[PDB]
Amino acid sequence: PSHKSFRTKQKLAKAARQNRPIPQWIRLRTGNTVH
Amino acid sequence: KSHTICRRCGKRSFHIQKSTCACCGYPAAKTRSYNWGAKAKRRRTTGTGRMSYLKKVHRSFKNGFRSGKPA
Amino acid sequence: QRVTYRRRLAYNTRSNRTRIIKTPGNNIRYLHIKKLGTIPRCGDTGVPLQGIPALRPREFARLSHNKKTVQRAYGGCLSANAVKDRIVRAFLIEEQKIVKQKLKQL
């Protein structure tokens, strides 16, 4: 909805930003994983 | 929606109408737990989070919880 | 043209009261008008009093004293007839008591 608590805005933003491509240089430092 | 986010355990198991969490029993002082729920216990017991303070205590024990500064 | 409500308070109710106006830009607009004021009513009889503007409760503070009361005993609380009825009844009761006390003392 619209009348959303501010914690929800942080909660929604973090959940969405988890779906983000893992950087190329990240792989170059041995190993980094998903999920 | 019949459940919302629980303030204590952060799971979407807080029943709005009963005003009680189905997971941890919030707002009861004690956490909901059951011996028939062995897998449920291991999902939320000590070690599933940070244990930031317990790691400090375990590290401090060897020296006898000493205080002060080195010479 | 079909016009939408300015607010987002769906399910228009008693509070949602609007007026259609034409703007200098040639647009039909909803203008929400607050409910009309209520004139004070007499305590004894209940008819609205005479000489008091019919405005809102919060608004009444802005008015001066003379604009909220009438220059008479119980002015702004009782009607003129109610005041007249109150005065004559009080005097007749007092006289009925004075003669009753006179009869008992003799």
């Binding site: 501010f6 805005k9 942080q10 929604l12 | - | -």
Partner: protein, 70 residues
């Protein structure tokens, strides 16, 4: 940038607990400029944004150049 060069307003990323009064004090004490208006919003990512409108006595471009983000 459009707001800065048009309406003499600077746009800041501010603290989450900052209110219009504290943003005014912080801007006044960090850039020696007097705001005449502050309007804020919360971005969908959980960050607060403040539109600080400056006095006509000051130029928002000058402050922006001084800050260095111009």
């Amino acid at each position: 940038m459009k707001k800065i060069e048009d309406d003499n307003t600077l746009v800041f990323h501010v603290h989450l607990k900052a209110n219009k009064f504290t943003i005014k004090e912080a801007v006044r004490k960090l850039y020696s400029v007097e705001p005449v208006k502050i309007n804020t919003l919360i971005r969908p990512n959980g960050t607060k944004k403040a539109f600080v409108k400056l006095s006509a006595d000051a130029d928002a471009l000058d402050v922006a150049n001084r800050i260095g983000f111009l």
